[PDB]
Amino acid sequence: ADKFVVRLPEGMREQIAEVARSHHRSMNSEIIARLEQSLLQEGA
Amino acid sequence: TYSSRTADKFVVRLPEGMREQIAEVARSHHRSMNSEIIARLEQSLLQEGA
Amino acid sequence: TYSSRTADKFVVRLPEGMREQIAEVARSHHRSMNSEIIARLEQSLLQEG
Amino acid sequence: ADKFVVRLPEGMREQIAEVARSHHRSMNSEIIARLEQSLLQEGALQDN
DNA sequence: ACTGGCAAAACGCCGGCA
DNA sequence: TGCCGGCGTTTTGCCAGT
């Protein structure tokens, strides 16, 4: 599977981890889950 | 203090052809792939916060 | 070939305060002012057929 | 009036040129008129 | 007007960490 | 799974030279 290194702004770094644990999934699992939701919003 | 060389990098292991899917969106919205990802994350985050 | 350093350049004379207004919305959308301007112009044009 | 040089993609210049000619306006006038209505259009997204 | 191009930023990605 | 220095690149904002 291909990968993309994402330069992230100030806050996100930590804030992204916070939501991951509370969702009981890894960071990469969180980001991709959010990303697919966003892309699904476009299907409107 | 916080440039793009300083910023927090994070490898996102994309599912098959999802990368190509971001790309198409990124082009149409006239932003880099980085900015694309950021913009979507940022918005997804703020939805839960309001 | 047609890169960024090849692209047609047009000097836009902007009215009072439009600059900061555009820059603000540009950051707001995670985009360079250039891309920001192009994006809006583009959408304006196809809206007109 | 302050300046800002725009790099336009392939077909944009001629595209804008035509529309301007259509509206009997300067190219710069056309660009601004459009950038104007584009800004206050989404600036009118204060609760839709 | 135009447009080479500069200096600085951002980009994409590698290849190495832990 | 996560972290990141740093390379080689384009892009970006904005000039001066024509």
Author numbering:
A (entry chain B): 16 to 59
B (entry chain A): 10 to 59
C (entry chain C): 10 to 58
D (entry chain D): 16 to 63
Wording from the paper:
The 108 amino acid, 12.3 kD AmrZ protein is a member of the ribbon-helix-helix (RHH) family of DNA binding proteins, sharing highest sequence similarity to the Arc and Mnt repressors from bacteriophage P22. AmrZ is necessary for alginate production, via the activation of algD, which is the first gene in the alginate biosynthetic operon.
The Δ42 variant of AmrZ (residues 1–66) contains the extended N-terminus and the RHH DNA binding domain, but has a truncated C-terminal domain. The dimer-dimer interface, which occludes approximately 290 Å2 of surface area on each dimer, is formed by a series of interactions between specific residues located on the loop connecting α-helix 1 and α-helix 2 on chains B and C. The insertion of the anti-parallel β-sheet from each AmrZ dimer into the major groove of the amrZ1 site provides for the recognition of two half sites, each with the sequence 5′-GGC (orange bases). Sequence dependent binding by AmrZ occurs via the interaction of three residues, Lys18, Val20, and Arg22, with the nucleotides. Lys18 from one AmrZ monomer is positioned where it can form hydrogen bonding interactions to the O6 and N7 atoms of the two guanine nucleotides, G23 and G24 (G4 and G5 on the other half site). The DNA binding β-sheet also orients the residue Arg22, from the other monomer of the dimer, to form a bidentate hydrogen bond to both the O6 and N7 atoms of the nucleotide G12 (G31 on the other half site). In the AmrZ structure, it appears that residue Val20 is poised to select for cytosine bases C13 and C14 (C32 and C33 on other half site) via a hydrophobic interaction.
